[PDB]
Amino acid sequence: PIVLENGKLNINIDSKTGCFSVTEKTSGHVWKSDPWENAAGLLTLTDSKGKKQTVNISKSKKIEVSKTAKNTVSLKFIDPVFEDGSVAKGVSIATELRLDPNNAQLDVEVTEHRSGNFTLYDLRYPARAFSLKTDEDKGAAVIPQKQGVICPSYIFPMNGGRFCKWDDATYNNKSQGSLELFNNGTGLTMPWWGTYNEKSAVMGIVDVSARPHMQYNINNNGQYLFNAKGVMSPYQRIVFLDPIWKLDQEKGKMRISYHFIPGGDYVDMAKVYQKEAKARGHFVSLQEKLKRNPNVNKLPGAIYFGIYGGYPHYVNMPGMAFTFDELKNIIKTIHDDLRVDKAFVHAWGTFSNFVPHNYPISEALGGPEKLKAAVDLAKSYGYLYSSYHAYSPMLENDPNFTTDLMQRDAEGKLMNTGSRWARVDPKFQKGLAQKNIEKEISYLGLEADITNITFAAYRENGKEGRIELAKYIDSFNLVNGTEHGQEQWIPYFDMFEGMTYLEDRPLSVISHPAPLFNLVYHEAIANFGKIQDPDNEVTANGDFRIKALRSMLFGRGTTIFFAPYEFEGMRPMIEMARDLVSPVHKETFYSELKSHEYLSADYKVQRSRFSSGTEVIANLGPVAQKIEGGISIPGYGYRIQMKDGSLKTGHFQVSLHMD
Amino acid sequence: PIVLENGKLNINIDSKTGCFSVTEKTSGHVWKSDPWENAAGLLTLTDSKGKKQTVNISKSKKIEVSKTAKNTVSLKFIDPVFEDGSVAKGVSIATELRLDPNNAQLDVEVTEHRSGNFTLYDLRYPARAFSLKTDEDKGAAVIPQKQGVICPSYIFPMNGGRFCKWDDATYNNKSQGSLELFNNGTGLTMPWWGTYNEKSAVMGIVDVSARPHMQYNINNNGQYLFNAKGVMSPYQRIVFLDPIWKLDQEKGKMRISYHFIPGGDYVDMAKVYQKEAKARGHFVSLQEKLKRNPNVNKLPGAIYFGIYGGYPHYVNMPGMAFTFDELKNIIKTIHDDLRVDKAFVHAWGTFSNFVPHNYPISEALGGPEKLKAAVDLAKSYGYLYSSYHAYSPMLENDPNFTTDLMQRDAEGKLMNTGSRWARVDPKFQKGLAQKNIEKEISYLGLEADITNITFAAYRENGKEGRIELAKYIDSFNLVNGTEHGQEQWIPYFDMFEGMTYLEDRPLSVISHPAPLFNLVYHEAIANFGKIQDPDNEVTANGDFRIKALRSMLFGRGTTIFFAPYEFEGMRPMIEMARDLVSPVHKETFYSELKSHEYLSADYKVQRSRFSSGTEVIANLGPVAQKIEGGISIPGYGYRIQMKDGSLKTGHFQVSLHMD
Ligand SMILES: O=S(=O)(O)O[C@@H]1[C@H](O[C@H]2O[C@@H]3CO[C@H]([C@H]2O)[C@H]3O[C@@H]2O[C@H](CO)[C@H](O)[C@H](O[C@H]3O[C@@H]4CO[C@@H]([C@H]4O)[C@H]3O)[C@H]2O)[C@@H](O)[C@H](O)O[C@@H]1CO
């Protein structure tokens, strides 16, 4: 064995195979290499007959492992062997392990690959490293899937239906797969992931120039590897997360930095990345944005109201579209009858063309003067207002539809034909916004703006155009928000609509939501519930009880999203949000989410602590449970210590009225 | 133009293409052939270079159409042409169109196919027939996906969040796909499907011997056919459902019977199929089952209670398993404190071996005399009782695991290696049940039994073993239930746990739950909610408010499924179900669901009529809505007319207690 050594870590590298264990010396925990096949890496490539296989690079014909410096090991995997015995001559992989001399940090990097006459695709490296042993380690995998989840490495008590779906998923394909970085679907929103047990934690931060995928395996024994062979898996149930380097696409540095934290968990992991988020320039705090624009202070304690009039999907849709007098009346009722002190009114359906032509203010709905009357009223309440804007759609039912604004690829093929809301080439979108946004700001006296779709993901293609649009919007110094967002857009916006959870998502039945993104960025970006899954809808992510309680735990604002005809049905939830979530949201708005803990064995009772001096304890399940000190938290209940010393206690109640 | 005609239908067969249209002469409606490509059928097959190809069989070299009887037309499609212009020489498809001489019924049958040197896979025939024009036809597709759904052929008002997901789904791949018959996952539970508008309805009933798949297309314009080419779809948005004949697997008669109903909708389709269901022998009424066993009358008004002790997943799991004294105390509380008059108590965790060895009664939990004490108490209340039973699992964590009880496929490979709950070959399962089920019945004095997993689906492979098991369980004249069920199993059981909805399923954001299965079978099988998605859990299918109201509309019973530690949290929902659902369930238990209607434009207000004389109106949305005569139904409210004329009204309310 080769040993790299500093004060905190022992790195033990097998010179025959290239596998390495990591001894974290403060706690004595040893992270093993691949417990299944002793594979340092898993390479996917075509063979001589062109079919693609995955090989264990530790079975390569030649393996060179050598220490070059006191802290650097070079590894070369030369001529891998296929399962039949055929050799991929001319194929090689070079990697490096680099131990930091002072900190508990190990950089792992794929530095070179060579294809021969073969084609290389995926490299899992390190392969199945830093695993937890299911039901031996008590801990979790930590995954920034949108707002974030953890995946416990052991079976625990929970509701009988959830228990069945949980355990069953760890024995089928629901517990294995891959996730992509920086999208608004199923993927990750921060470039890191980790595992921890009762002794120590390890996380890995992907290099800023790279875009691997992340393979996950949640308590699965690898039966998926053997189902096509029709034999039973001989492996142990483990938890692992692996980087998937896309050798056929990766232009960046294929480097991941591992950080080892004794006695840490997902909270410690988030704070480690938070330092890295600042160095990368993503972190622009809400206090800095408030210095630049005092109207940012209209956000703390505001309910986000989406009034959906069938637009952008349809112009003047019968039964859905609102008149500007109706908009005015809804705003007035929210203030005068419902006594909402602070609100963000987002009117979806104010223009008579389809997006991306966000003009003119629709005459059929009342015209500019009546929209201005509604906006004037909201401004007199101190509310923020914005119309719906988007500069990326190109809709089939728009009479102005044109492919002139769409992007084509090298073959001349239209891109995004199957994604109507994101069809305009971003290099056009500042110019599309320039057509009317300034006329609308000037005429209505706007103090805020929401822009949708364009900033929901962060992909390389078109990012220059999107940055241009972002700079142009931010140059107005309005309180501005955007749909979903990503960390890269944090410097340009004050709030994100979303950054919570999809309803149907990989891992939903074998993970618990954790406020991983807000553990990093709550000080820098305010977020609200997503409009497709608002706090007034009952979905896989809960009803109003669960969603209101989680809002306070996680530090996001209320979203009430509705068609106008629904308004009277919203009053009770508007009032409950006004009385419970809004004061807490107002107090914690600018502060750091310092810690989050799960207090019950079924993870339903949680405690969050904010640097404003606020503590939120909530119980997302139906039975009351006791925590430390004998204090009992009711089902769908809360115990909130406010900065002013008041202790808000109570719970949600469902009652049956039988006339 | 070749014409088949009777008094009600005119069948117009084009003799160049083989496409046909059906004029329904009462209403004047013309059901069109494939509006996109004018394809009579879509054949998937390998080419000369072995690549999979989908061809329009109406472009074959030779097409022969001829009247071979007065009401029979024979069609033959010879030598299909690939997209590159090469000919699949020696491939032929023969079909027959047979018009009933009297009724509005048209048989369509694939009679012969010959592959030559190619390999045939799938045949949609008829292809894209009986379609609806999106936003012109105002009707729906009717799909018996589990309990059943309808998919409106137009956009309509609904909550803003649901509206965005709905409309967006009609433009991406969520609105196209295929479903399979008779599984417990995403599939169909009855072998029929259909479309209707304001003028008439058509449904196709699949031959009892065949097993096609069902292709759906819900208001999609076919962009999925063009994304890889990078061009915009030139086709119109439509709704269609096609049979997919699996030519490489199908050994049955590939026939579908189309029935035409002027002025009909999904209710009429279900009643038509009800006749065919009685003809096939699936239909055995609950009244006949009650005459054979009077204990069936312990089911009306009963709440189904599943006490989940971490079994069958684990034996004696800490924090989850219940002792038999604790079971006794739960039964005592449900009766004495919660005043539940009728109940089916189902205890998951009474044996000390893993299924499929359902014995002995666990000593660790207290032993036979303590389980007997608990079961005797429930019997003294009039409750039904069953332990958890399953004869199909083969678990990795069972010390008795063996592959000797598993099935192997034609290659000798183990089957269901990735499906642990259904690994035992059905032909072994009766012998496994024989090992203890009779002793448990005799010792405990049982009146009831539930058997799980084995009858959740109906597959051709293993049906003799399953039927052998069902005949064995049915021999004891117990009130017996099974998990999920299928129409084929209705003769052998009194109740199904399930036959409702998956949480995450294709078409969930573009369909509405409709009681299709119960419109057929409510008189012949009682169903209750699914244990994975019980009425006490908040899921994609709703909260307790939504699920209780839908229960009364659809005619199913309440399911409360809980770990023992949750029990105090169940009490409010048990009491609401006791007071609201149980009386209605009791009165409607034996009757026919005569009709179901959607009364609001957003499909949230619904009305169901039972032949008991009971009318259930309910509002599954948050805002009060008015129906005919100005009657207003509150949000999450109900209006019920009982058999004795009395009127029940009320609603659920969520409120916030703050100390
Ligand atoms: O299609 S799925 O079966 O659901 O598979 C998904 C996943 O694809 C999803 O990714 C995103 C999450 O919802 C959408 C699905 O397509 C995706 O988000 C959408 O992306 C758009 C940008 O391209 C928009 O942002 C869109 O939301 C905006 O556009 C219109 C207008 O107004 C609204 C909206 O109605 C506004 O919010 C947004 O919803 C699939 O890729 C993956 O394989 O699995 C997933 C399963 O859940």
Ligand SMILES: O=S(=O)(O)O[C@@H]1[C@H](O[C@H]2O[C@@H]3CO[C@H]([C@H]2O)[C@H]3O[C@@H]2O[C@H](CO)[C@H](O)[C@H](O[C@H]3O[C@@H]4CO[C@@H]([C@H]4O)[C@H]3O)[C@H]2O)[C@@H](O)[C@H](O)O[C@@H]1CO
């Ligand atoms: O895996 S998915 O992502 O959900 O893809 C599904 C679909 O796979 C599903 O099919 C069934 C529906 O839930 C299960 C998923 O695997 C399937 O049901 C299970 O089938 C078993 C019988 O074979 C059992 O009936 C099992 O329920 C029993 O087993 C244990 C023990 O006790 C409980 C249970 O815990 C009892 O209910 C049942 O859950 C996939 O096949 C299809 O292709 O696509 C779908 C995507 O939605």
Ligand SMILES: [Cl-]
């Ligand atoms: Cl959240």
Ligand SMILES: [Cl-]
């Ligand atoms: Cl239901």
Ligand code: NA
């Ligand atoms: Na700003």
Ligand code: NA
């Ligand atoms: Na029976």
